[PDB]
Amino acid sequence: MLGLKTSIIGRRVIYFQEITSTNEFAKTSYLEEGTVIVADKQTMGHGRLNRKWESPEGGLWLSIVLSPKVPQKDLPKIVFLGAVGVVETLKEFSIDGRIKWPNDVLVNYKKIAGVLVEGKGDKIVLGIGLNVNNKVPNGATSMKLELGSEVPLLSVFRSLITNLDRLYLNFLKNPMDILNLVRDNMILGVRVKILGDGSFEGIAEDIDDFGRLIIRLDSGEVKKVIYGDVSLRFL
Amino acid sequence: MLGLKTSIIGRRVIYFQEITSTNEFAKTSYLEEGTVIVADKQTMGHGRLNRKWESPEGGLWLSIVLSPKVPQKDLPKIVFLGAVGVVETLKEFSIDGRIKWPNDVLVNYKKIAGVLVEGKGDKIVLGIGLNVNNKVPNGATSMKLELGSEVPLLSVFRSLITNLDRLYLNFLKNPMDILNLVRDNMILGVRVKILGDGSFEGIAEDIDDFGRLIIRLDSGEVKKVIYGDVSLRFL
Ligand SMILES: Nc1ncnc2c1ncn2[C@@H]1O[C@H](COP(=O)(O)OP(=O)(O)O)[C@@H](O)[C@H]1O
Ligand SMILES: Nc1ncnc2c1ncn2[C@@H]1O[C@H](COP(=O)(O)OP(=O)(O)O)[C@@H](O)[C@H]1O
Ligand SMILES: O=C(O)CCCC[C@@H]1SC[C@@H]2NC(=O)N[C@@H]21
Ligand SMILES: O=C(O)CCCC[C@@H]1SC[C@@H]2NC(=O)N[C@@H]21
């Protein structure tokens, strides 16, 4: 009844009035590539390290099953597909989303969306949480708050699915292309603090050919950050 | 993202851009009660006696998984739930649909929808095919042909699911109610013929407490027709 016209992402969509976590359901269940798992609300939504992701009714909480046939070294770029897709959808609705490396989307430095990619081999789950009309925690924002009016949730869904399908199809043929789109939509040229084993500060200059964040410390030392258990903080 | 407010039917919805048959998928897949299987198009859609059901893009082709903890003699009424649900939805859209025993819905005697119920052990699969904006076989009709305009397919889905959930929840408590709703929306008082071995003709008087069609032959003999591989047409 949805009449989606995408090639891979959206071939099938499993909708839930409520679920524990779309990412958990997607990782656990036997699902075909391109299947989208979406729920009105999540009772156990999470980000990295099992951190709580508030998922009340009004937001877009979904996961996509992917089985990218590309080199291993390219797999880490899947998170970027999600971030860019969200940014493109926000721009369609005239909202200025910017990427906070490597998985967040901010609007005026307030978090409007988060991307979580999980994989156990050939099966990769791309999770996306986007605040639309729902109430949000402090430090966050939503499409409704930025526009001053409610936004049809299904319209956001259709837009995002269309963008992700296009981005994914091109990623399979040219896995390097996504990097340019990230650069063009990422917050750069500002001081950041990298949190992990210890921490250091510097100017976020750009991302390299592997998607690593390039940071220039005051001494002039250049560090390349690989995303894993490391958190980025703006000053 | 659909934000369905139903209690049971629609708690989960599995959408397909393309599928062989929603009924076949519902029968062979483990699915929680209330799960709706829906597809833009069916390649192997079928009615009674495996007869092909044209299911092109534009129509509403779906199946609902049920498991009625109701007595053993009420189960044949499930088909009526589907038929009445369709009639109610059509009325909301300014269309007067009437039920042709035992599973068809006609508009000015042209078929606009068909219902197919298949009980498979534990669960019962309620299949409904409704012509909305799609092309239909000669002699048939659609909501678009009746209204002369493009009808939003998702709005029809929402309406039907809402009606079915209400009808089903009541059916679980008051299983006899559906019979009177059928009687008041069924084509009666007309002549019909029953094909096959031992064929005969007569006036379709009403349906009894078991949903059997009551026919009065010209001799005065009364026959009761059960919903089997029964082929019934008007005269
Ligand atoms: N709906 C929401 N919108 C925005 N931020 C949220 C929401 N729910 C939770 N958060 C915050 O966002 C964090 C998201 O995951 P996290 O793994 O910390 O990564 P990030 O580095 O992107 O902040 C949570 O720890 C929480 O503080
Ligand atoms: N999209 C459609 N709309 C209306 N009628 C259809 C459609 N596709 C098939 N049919 C008709 O419906 C039949 C299948 O359902 P069935 O309940 O056995 O009713 P019928 O009494 O018409 O044979 C097919 O054999 C065909 O004649
Ligand atoms: O900000 C992050 O660190 C990522 C948050 C990802 C949230 C989404 S909501 C859909 C999917 N299901 C989950 O339990 N998490 C992701
Ligand atoms: O008139 C009939 O015989 C009933 C037709 C039922 C058609 C629907 S379309 C959704 C579901 N999937 C199928 O293959 N058949 C039913």
Residue closest via CA to ligand 4's atom 11 equals B127
C-beta atoms of A1 and B10 within 8 A: no
Strands (E), A67-152: 98-100, 104-107, 110-119, 124-130
Tokens of A15: 């909708």
CB–CB of A210/A167 below 8 Å? no
* CATH class of the B2-187 domain in this structure: alpha beta
- Measured from the Cα of B55, ligand 4's closest atom is 9
Nearest beta carbon to residue B1 from set A11, A12, A153: A153
Q: Which letter, b or e, does each residue of A74-104 get, where b requires 16 or more Cβ atoms within 10 Å of its Cβ?
A: bbbbbbbbbbbbbbbbbeeeebebbbbbbbb
C-beta atoms of A3 and B60 within 8 A: no
Residues of chain A with CATH 2.30.30.100: 188-235
Q: Taking CB atoms and an 8 Å cutoff, what residues of chain A touch B12? A: 14-17
Interface list for chain A against chain B, based on CB atoms closer than 8 Å: 1-4, 6, 10-17, 38, 40, 57, 60, 62, 153-154, 156-157
Beta bridge partners of B225: B213
Q: Which letter, b or e, does each residue of A53-68 get, where b requires 16 or more Cβ atoms within 10 Å of its Cβ?
A: bbbeebbbbbbbbbeb
CB–CB of A158/A184 below 8 Å? no
The closest of B222, B219, B195, B224 to B207, measured between CA atoms, is B224
Q: Taking CB atoms and an 8 Å cutoff, what residues of chain B touch A1? A: 15, 38, 40, 60, 62, 153-154, 156-157
Could you say which DSSP state residue A19 is in? B
Q: Taking CB atoms and an 8 Å cutoff, what residues of chain B touch A17? A: 4, 6, 10-12
C-alpha span between B143 and B134 (Å, rounded) = 9
Place of tokens 């994914």: A168
CB–CB of A223/A199 below 8 Å? no
Which CA distances in Å does B106 have to A43, B86, B116, B154? 44, 10, 15, 22
Tokens of A64: 């996509």
Place of tokens 């129509």: B59
CATH: 2.30.30.100, 1.10.10.10, 2.170.120.12, 3.40.50.720. Which one for B188-235?
A: 2.30.30.100
Residues of chain A with CATH 3.30.930.10: 2-187
The closest of B8, A193, A211 to A202, measured between CA atoms, is A193
User: What approach was used to elucidate this structure?
Assistant: X-ray
Distance B114 CA to ligand 2 centre (A): 7
Q: What is the resolution of this structure in A?
A: 1.6
Tokens of A124: 């990769």
C-alpha span between A57 and B3 (Å, rounded) = 8
Tokens of B28: 């062979």
C-alpha span between B132 and B93 (Å, rounded) = 11
**Helix-helix angle A177-185:A153-173, to 10 degrees:** 140
C-alpha span between B169 and B178 (Å, rounded) = 11
Distance (Å) from the alpha carbon of A3 to chain B's nearest alpha carbon = 6
Dihedral angle, C-alpha B195, B198, B202, B208, nearest 10 °: -90
C-alpha span between A29 and B204 (Å, rounded) = 50
Annotated ligand binding at A104? The verdict is yes
The closest of B64, B84, B68 to B178, measured between CA atoms, is B84
Write out residues with Cβ below 6 Å of ligand 3.
A 21-23, 42, 45-48, 53, 55, 61-63, 103-104, 114-116, 127-129
CA A38 to chain centre: 15
* DSSP letter for each residue of B66-102: E---S-TTTGGGHHHHHHHHHHHHHHHTT---EEETT
C-beta atoms of B157 and A3 within 8 A: no
CB–CB of A169/A157 below 8 Å? no
Q: Taking CB atoms and an 8 Å cutoff, what residues of chain B touch A156? A: 1
Annotated ligand binding at A103? The verdict is yes
